[PDB]
Amino acid sequence: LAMGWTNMLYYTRGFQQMGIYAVMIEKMILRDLCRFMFVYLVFLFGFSTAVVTLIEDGKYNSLYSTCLELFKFTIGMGDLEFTENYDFKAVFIILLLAYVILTYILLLNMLIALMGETVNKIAQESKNIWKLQRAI
Amino acid sequence: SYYKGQTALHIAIERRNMTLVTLLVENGADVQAAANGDFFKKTKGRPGFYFGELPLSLAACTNQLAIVKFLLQNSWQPADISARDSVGNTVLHALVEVADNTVDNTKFVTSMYNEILILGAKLHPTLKLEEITNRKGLTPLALAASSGKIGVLAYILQREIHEPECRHLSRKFTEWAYGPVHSSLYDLSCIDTCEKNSVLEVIAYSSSETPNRHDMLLVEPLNRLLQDKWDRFVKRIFYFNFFVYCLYMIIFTAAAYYRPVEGLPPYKLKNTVGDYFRVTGEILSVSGGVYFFFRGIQYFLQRRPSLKSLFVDSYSEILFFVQSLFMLVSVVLYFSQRKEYVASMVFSLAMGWTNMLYYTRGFQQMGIYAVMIEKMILRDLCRFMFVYLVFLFGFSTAVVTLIEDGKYNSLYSTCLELFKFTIGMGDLEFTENYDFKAVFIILLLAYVILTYILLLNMLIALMGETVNKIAQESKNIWKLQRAITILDTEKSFLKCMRKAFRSGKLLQVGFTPDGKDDYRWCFRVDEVNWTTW
Amino acid sequence: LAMGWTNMLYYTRGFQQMGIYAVMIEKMILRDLCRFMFVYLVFLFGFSTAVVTLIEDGKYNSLYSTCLELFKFTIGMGDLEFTENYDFKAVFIILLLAYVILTYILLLNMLIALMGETVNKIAQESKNIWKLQRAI
Amino acid sequence: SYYKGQTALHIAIERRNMTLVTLLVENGADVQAAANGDFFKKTKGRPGFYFGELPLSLAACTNQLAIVKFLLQNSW
Ligand code: NA
């Protein structure tokens, strides 16, 4: 049901502006997800493994829970004080701050690189691709 | 009906055979024949070459100069100039129509126009052609303005003739010169108030489909004229209006914020200053609402615009009208013993407070900013909200189907819970009454990723169109808005006074071909020229 | 104390890159705050007055509290369910959603307009201004 | 007060008539006359062509090279 509801973007073709917008979405999904998700996943897994190793025992002592807790920092609702069963608070704080800084730099560079290729050579291609799709 | 009405004279004219044309003319056939074939109609079928329907107009518009000279300089039977076809177009009107805003076409059209004008003036100096109008009451200048012919209007407004006995045909002059500084003049007749339709009135009120509305008000005299009128009185009038509106809105909000809460209005006043003040505030607010209602209805009645031009244009009259309607509905409910008047009044209050962006025009930077906001709202909301709503509804339906029973088992609650993820306060663990936790987590993560990609692409696409072609358009649109404001304020005479006036009386040409002199309401402009001495 | 601590940006001049950065900050503060704060304040006051009028009686029945509650929506921690002492829930929700949409559009347009003027004619001016400051 | 202070020498200088300028010079009239008209003031009214208020400055600023040569190289 969810896939079918989201799969109605195919009918925008035939409406010029909407067709161009859908083509842009398709191109971005096909050409940037693989290139931009590998690095983020590597960072997340590394820091999640480190933090899970540090903790001694409790509710957040598994891997899935800590992975989720570190993922929450990207939708802007991280906690920074989500556990207290451990030692060497300095290590914990340092790790969390380093992860936050690195991921924000990564997203900023993602955005700038994505914008760079658009030197105004993005509409002349999208329009042509949309015309080809309408032709088929 | 297609090729009917054609005559051999038209062929002779359009074959470029001077000798054959002369021989055919010598036969004695009439030279005022008109062709009524549908091929010569305005837009009855994509094929068609409209030329004014007369042979003289064929010569005028078909590169024919020596031919038209021969036709108009032949003692046998010279072709009349003032002839008007079925639509009423004259040779000048046909020339204006044939223009298509191209450099070669524009130079050709202006050259031919000048030649025909000088020839006609020389042959019949008594008659003036620029005052002859077709059925629709459009002069050649007005017709050029209406159709957005930039080149013809530019040439006509500053037409200069440097030949004896033809100076009076020109509009731009040179009163005096000294060193590198010399002062020019411009004729304002038929620019500000022609008593039928001015250039400013026609250009300002023209609907948006006209090609070059924005880029037409850059011609020399018009810009200075608008700036002068503004600085003369529109600044003061506009500031006074701004102050009055702000005072009224402060009164309205203060009166409404203190509404009594007892139940089932109307409420009986008490013998205290507070109640009298509140009653006065309510009366003032209602009076303002009804006044705006009449103003809006009057404007809509007078202009009578189209349906697709009611959002591209009149974007503020609609909002003021809507606010007035909300206030009127609120008072009607208030006097009907109900409790919805609170909702109606608060809607009106919020809309009115946010509807004060209209007064930024008059402040350059703020006006440009407001214009940018308006353009974005009008041109991206519809294109960028449909996709987001589709995604949200799809995933909300999926998640609501998954859950078994509880507080979040409806549709509105889950829609809100998924919307919270976009203002950056989503939960990801907001319920626990279900099965297959993997499905739940997968759905939520997919929704988050898709919506973030969507917003990123929204931003990049929005930025792309701004390749630095966004200020040159915003500035022009703001100038047009200020121009319409100036025209409106001038039209609505302040109180019973009347002092607005174009410029000062003056004598420039000395004498017409007739003995009497003449006056033409000049508007002097001072310029400094250093090179090209 | 706070003003003095933040007033040490004046000593960056003498370090080229930092001097340019400080000059950019100064120019932006002087040339965009007044032009970009008036509209936001107008919107905030209008919707705050509307919402405060709607509510009947309680803790959020004043003006300062509701102004703060609506301001919280811009640092990304708004609530959307912060009170329940009123009638016509549809009106409340509609007002809050309209405010959020309008303010996000406003910030987006703020950013795009700010970027537009930088058509790469921003370094040649900043460098010259920094040189003038060093000269003085 | 507007065109006051003007003298025929200024016209002769600003008409580019070398022969007429020479003939007028030969008359013996003073060549240090100053025009105090408001037309020659700095910014008293948008019209105005400030030139230093002396004929030599008129020659200097009005493309006049041979004329200034003649003025400065005349034994009269
Ligand atoms: Na947050």
Instruction: Tell me if chain A has a CB within 8 Å of the CB of B463.
Output: yes
User: What is the Cα–Cα distance from A10 to B488, expressed in whole angstroms?
Assistant: 48
Phi, psi of A11 (to 5 degrees): -90, 0
Q: Within an 8 Å CB–CB cutoff, is residue B365 touching chain C?
A: yes
Q: Is B173 helix (H, G, I), strand (E, B) or coil?
A: strand
Q: How many residues does chain D have?
A: 76
Q: Do D47 and B179 touch (CB under 8 A)?
A: no
The answer to whether B171 and B158 have CB atoms below 8 angstroms apart is: yes
Q: Residue C61: how many CA atoms within 13 Å on its side-chain side?
A: 11
| Chain C closest-CA separation from residue B419 CA (Å) | 10
Name chain C contacts of B462, Cβ cutoff 8 Å. 108, 112
D6 touches chain B (CB under 8 A): no
Instruction: Please state, in angstroms and as integers, the Cα–Cα distance from residue B208 to each residue in A35, B217, B422, B475, following that order.
Output: 46, 14, 37, 17
**B424 annotated to a ligand binding site:** yes
Secondary structure (DSSP) of B468-480: STTHHHHHHHHHH
Is D5 annotated to bind ligand? yes
Write the CA distances from B391 to B311, B386, B410, integer angstroms.
28, 9, 18
Tokens representing B142 are 């007005």
Q: Determine whether the interchain pair D63/B533 forms a contact, defined as Cβ–Cβ distance below 8 Å.
A: yes
| B424 CA from centroid of ligand 1 (Å) | 5
User: In angstroms, what is the C-alpha Rg of chain B?
Assistant: 33
d(CA B397, CA B347): 31
- Which bin fits A88, alpha (ψ -120 to 50), beta or left (φ > 0)? left
Q: Which residues of C touch B346 (CB under 8 A)?
A: 50-51, 53-54, 91, 95
The answer to whether chain C touches chain B by having 3 or more C-beta pairs less than 8 angstroms apart is yes
Q: How many CB atoms lie within 10 A of CB D43?
A: 7
Please report which residue ranges of chain C form alpha helices under DSSP H: 2-6, 16-54, 64-71, 89-116, 123-135
Nearest to C95 among B257, B350, B466 (CB): B350
**Residue B181 to residue D46, Cβ atoms within 8 A:** no
Which tokens is B118 given? 């000088």
Interval between CA A79 and ligand 1 midpoint (Å): 10
- Residue B330 to residue B347: CA distance in whole angstroms: 10
Does residue B493 belong to the interface with chain A, where contact is any CB pair within 8 Å? no
Distances (CA, A) of C34 to A25, B309, B361, B408, C30: 37, 34, 16, 45, 8
Alpha carbons B366 and C39: distance in angstroms, whole number: 9
Judge D/A contact: 3 or more CB pairs < 8 A: no
Which residues, other chains included, contact B429 with Cβ-Cβ below 8 Å and sequence gap of 6+?
none
- Using an 8 Å CB-CB cutoff, list chain B residues near A6: 390-391, 394-395, 450
DSSP for A110-130, written as a single string? HHHHHHHT-SSTTHHHHHHHH
Select from C50, C49, C62, C48 the least CA-distant residue to C88: C50
CA distance to partner chain D, nearest, from residue B203 (Å)? 31
Has C79 been labeled as part of a binding site? yes
The span from the CA of A69 to the CA of A54, in Å, is 15
What the block records as the tokens of B295 is 């103003």
Beta bridge partners of B528: B181
Q: Are B443 and B399 in contact (CB under 8 A)?
A: yes
Cα–Cα dist B34/B6, whole Å: 8
Chains near C with 3+ CB pairs less than 8 A apart are: B
Residue-by-residue DSSP string for B31-64: S------GGGSSSSSS------SSHHHHHHHTT-
CA of B425 to the centre of ligand 1 (A): 5
B18/B33 Cα distance (integer angstroms):
19
d(CA B332, CA B350): 19
Q: Which of A1, A18, A120 sits opposite B401 (nearest CB)?
A: A1
The distance of Cα B118 from the centroid of its chain, to the nearest Å, equals 34
For residue A13, the cross-strand partners are none
C-alpha to C-alpha distance for B207 and B313, rounded to whole angstroms: 8
Are B447 and B418 contacting, i.e. CB atoms less than 8 angstroms apart? yes
Q: How far is the CA of B129 from the centre of ligand 1 (A)?
A: 73
Residue type, B302: Q
What φ, ψ does residue B453 adopt, rounded to 5°?
-60, -40
What angle do helix axes C16-54 and C123-135 make, rounded to 10 degrees? 110
- Experimentally, how was this structure solved? cryo-EM
Q: How many CB pairs under 8 A join B and D?
A: 14
CB B208 within 8 A of CB B313: yes
Contact B141, B490 (CB under 8 A): no
C-alpha separations of B315 from A26, B57, B284, B489, B509 in Å: 35, 43, 26, 18, 46
- Looking at residue C95, its amino acid is L
Interface contact flag, B526 D47, Cβ < 8 Å: yes
Closest-CA residue to B214 (of B377, B373, B383, B371): B371
What's the order of all strands across the beta sheet hosting B525-528?
B173-178, B181-185, B525-528
Shortest distance between the Cα of B41 and any Cα of chain D, in A, equals: 54
From chain B, the residues in CB contact with C46 under 8 A are 349-350, 352-354
Dihedral angle of Cα B45, B49, B55, B57, to the nearest 10 degrees: 120
Whats the size of chain A, residue-wise? 136
Shortest CA distance to C74 belongs to which of C107, C97, C48? C107
Determine the distance in angstroms separating the CA of D15 from the nearest CA of chain B, rounded to an integer: 9
Would you say B120 and B130 are in contact if contact means Cβ atoms under 8 Å apart?
no
Q: Which residue in C99, D55, C46 sits closest to B346, CA to CA?
A: C46
Q: Which amino acid is at A85?
A: N
8 A C-beta contact, residue B290 and residue B324? yes
Find, among A80, A75, C71, A104, the residue nearest to B421 by Cα: A75
- Comparing CB atoms, the residue among B261, B366, B466 nearest residue C116 is B466
Are residues B467 and A17, on separate chains, in Cβ contact within 8 Å? Answer: no
d(CA B495, CA B165) in angstroms, rounded, equals 47
Q: What is the DSSP string of B251-314?
A: HHHHHHHT---SSSS-----SSHHHHHHHHHHHHHHHHHHHHHHHHHHHHHHH---STHHHHS-
A28 in Cβ contact with A129 (< 8 Å): no
Question: By C-alpha distance, which of C31, C24, C33 is closest to C124?
Answer: C24
Interface B:C, Cβ pairs < 8 A: 96
Interface residue D28 vs chain B (CB under 8 A) = no
Handedness of CA B407, B411, B413, B419 (dihedral sign): positive
Q: And the tokens for B301?
A: 């009645």
What are the φ and ψ backbone dihedral angles of B187, each rounded to 5 degrees?
-85, 125
CB B109 within 8 A of CB B156: no
For residue B303, CA distances in Å to B193, B364, B470, B483, B487 come to: 19, 28, 30, 17, 14
DSSP secondary structure string, D3-71?
STT--HHHHHHHHT-HHHHHHHHHTT--S------GGGSSSSSS------SSHHHHHHHTT-SHHHHHH
Q: Would you say B354 is a known binding-site residue?
A: yes
Q: How wide is the angle at C-alpha C118 spanned by C-alphas C112 and C124, nearest 5°?
A: 165
Closest by CA to B175, choosing from B533, B531, B523, is: B523
Q: Please list every residue in chain B whose beta carbon sits closer than 8 Å to the beta carbon of residue C100.
A: 423
Nearest partner of B194 among B121, B125, B128, B138, judged by Cα: B138
For A8, which of B390, B446, B454 is closest by C-beta distance? B390
Q: Which residue has the tokens 């002068």?
A: B228
Reduce the DSSP state of residue B178 to 3 states and report it: strand
Name the nearest CA neighbour of B477 among B371, B361, B360. B371
- The reply to whether residue B426 touches residue A75, judged by beta carbons under 8 angstroms, is yes
- Tell me if B199 sits within 8 A of B189, measured CB to CB: no
Q: B261, B270, B274: which is closest to C58 by C-alpha?
A: B261
Does B426 sit within 8 Å of A2, measured CB to CB?
A: no
Cα separation, B479 vs B298, in Å, equals: 25
Report CB contact under 8 Å: C102, B354: yes
Q: Which of B346, B381, B459 sits opposite C50 (nearest CB)?
A: B346
- What six digits make up the tokens of A71? 């993922």
Distance CA B159, CA C2 (A): 67
D53 is in an annotated binding site: no
For B343, the closest of C51, C88, C115 (CB atoms) is: C88
Q: What are the helix (H) ranges across B355-436?
A: 364-402, 412-419
Neighbours of B169 (CB within 10 A): 19
Tell me the backbone φ, ψ of residue A112, rounded to 5 degrees.
Answer: -65, -40
Residue B176 near chain D (CB below 8 Å): no
